[PDB]
Paper text:
The crystal structure of the sfCherry-[name](10–11) hairpin in complex with [name](1–9) was determined at a resolution of 2.6 Å. Analysis of the complex shows that the reconstituted [name] is attached to the target protein (sfCherry) in a structurally ordered way. We concluded that insertion of the [name] hairpin at the permissive site Asp169/Gly170 of sfCherry was the better choice for folding of the target and subsequent binding to [name](1–9). The crystal asymmetric unit contains two copies of the complex. With two complexes in the asymmetric unit, and two linking chain segments between the two protein components in each case, there are four linking polypeptide segments. All of these segments are well ordered and clearly visible in the final electron-density map. When the [name] components of the two independent complexes are spatially overlapped, the sfCherry components differ in the two cases by a rotation of only 9°. The relative orientation of the two components differs by 9° when the two complexes are compared. This appears essentially as a minor hinge motion through the two points of connection; twisting and rotation about the other orthogonal direction is evidently limited by the double connection. The [name] dimer interface is mediated through β-strand 10 (inserted in sfCherry) via the sequence Gln180, Ile182 and Leu183 and the loop Phe145, Asn146 and Ser147 connecting strand 6 and strand 7 of [name](1–9). The crystal structure exhibits strong packing interactions in all three dimensions owing to the dimerization of the reconstituted [name], the linkage between [name] and sfCherry (creating linkages in the xy plane) and the dimerization of sfCherry (creating linkages in the z direction).
A modular strategy for protein crystallization using split green fluorescent protein ([name]) as a crystallization partner is demonstrated. In the present study, the protein chosen as a target for crystallization was superfolder Cherry (sfCherry), a version of red fluorescent protein engineered in our laboratory. sfCherry was chosen as a test protein so that the folding of the target could be monitored by red fluorescence while the [name] reconstitution could be monitored by green fluorescence. Our new folding-enhanced sfCherry contains six mutations: R36H, K92T, R125L, S147T, K162N and N196D. Also, previous studies on [name] have shown that it can form the basis for a complementation system: fragments composed of either β-strand 11 or a hairpin comprised of β-strands 10 and 11 can reassemble with truncated forms of [name] lacking these segments.
Author numbering:
A (entry chain C): 4 to 65, 69 to 263
B (entry chain A): 3 to 64, 68 to 194
Write the structure that this text describes.
Amino acid sequence: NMAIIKEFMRFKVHMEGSVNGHEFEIEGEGEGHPYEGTQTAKLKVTKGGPLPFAWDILSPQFSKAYVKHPADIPDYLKLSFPEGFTWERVMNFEDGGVVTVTQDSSLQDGEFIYKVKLLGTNFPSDGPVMQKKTMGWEASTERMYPEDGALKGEINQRLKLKDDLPDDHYLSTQTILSKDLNEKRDHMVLLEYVTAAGITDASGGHYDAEVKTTYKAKKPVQLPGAYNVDIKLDITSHNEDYTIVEQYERAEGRHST
Amino acid sequence: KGEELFTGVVPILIELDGDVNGHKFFVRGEGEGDATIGKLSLKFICTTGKLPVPWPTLVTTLVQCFSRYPDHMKRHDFFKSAMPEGYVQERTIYFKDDGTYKTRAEVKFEGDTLVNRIELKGIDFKEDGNILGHKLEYNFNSHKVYITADKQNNGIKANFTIRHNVEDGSVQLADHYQQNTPIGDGPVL
């Protein structure tokens, strides 16, 4: 009927959080097309600015009512309204850093209301998060599936690191020198083979996080089967110290197999 | 990026103006590199008549952008990254118990061909030494070029030792100290 969620919706978001002992608050405004899978937001740091850490760990915490769902796939979070839903999330980064979130999504006066509480913990001081070496998120796929009477999701999320240098490696060389027997000038004929080596593991460009989210509707609505959601988050702009940031996201659901 | 340029066979032009202990010479060469297999096929010609130095000594001097970088190491390729703009390759070669080469080269794209233009100056070479005396065998051996990226130059550093077989059975070593640097001003990655 689309009487509750319109084709275009605005939301308001508040985040209070503490990362490595640094408190802060963020208030922001956003808008988008819930059925098209597209949304934007402009965030402002209202307290504890500027932030000593990378913005990229906060960006995924700013909206799953905006995911585009096929008709045969029940939209669990859309159906949760007007009452709304909450979600809680655990991000485990490869270097031991952890981000935890609890959020509340409600609907008032034709606008979504987001309330966020966050903690980052055990981030190494020379790590890319505290060193602001992150370049933003790679496109993600969240595996969704019903469990414990709720909707859960699972992401292997790649964060791009600031490009440093070639690092350390070597080149293996082979060369044969010959002569052209019909060549009347002093000359050298050469054939050479060079291949690079010294690095196996292949990833110094990326910072990985194991993410597990739980989405609970405040009222008992219909749960979908197991499926996937493709997600891409972009930072469209920002100021120098990242106290003002604009974001964009596209998310669309599809069948798993 | 630049990897697109090297996805296939690339024609090569090389020009060298040398000076060694006053002996002046010019060497030109032509051929094609393949970066996918890391192969080089080239023929070089001295236009000044007799070459005052042995050919093997000019080999390292005479286009590492054609080195094959395995898929996982592709982001670590400095040479292809500077293209088409190109890079400046400087070396100082210490020949054991002998003189030293000093080279400055610009490796870039002129049209569809990869161009390497070198300027070489040798000094302090023994008149009866292995180089000026032409005692080196005609052949080359396998080596390892150790590459480390250096700091403020927005580019890479390198060093390695070349083993030149001497016809008397001994070995003439050449210590290479290399540094590179882009041409265009901006991000390389």
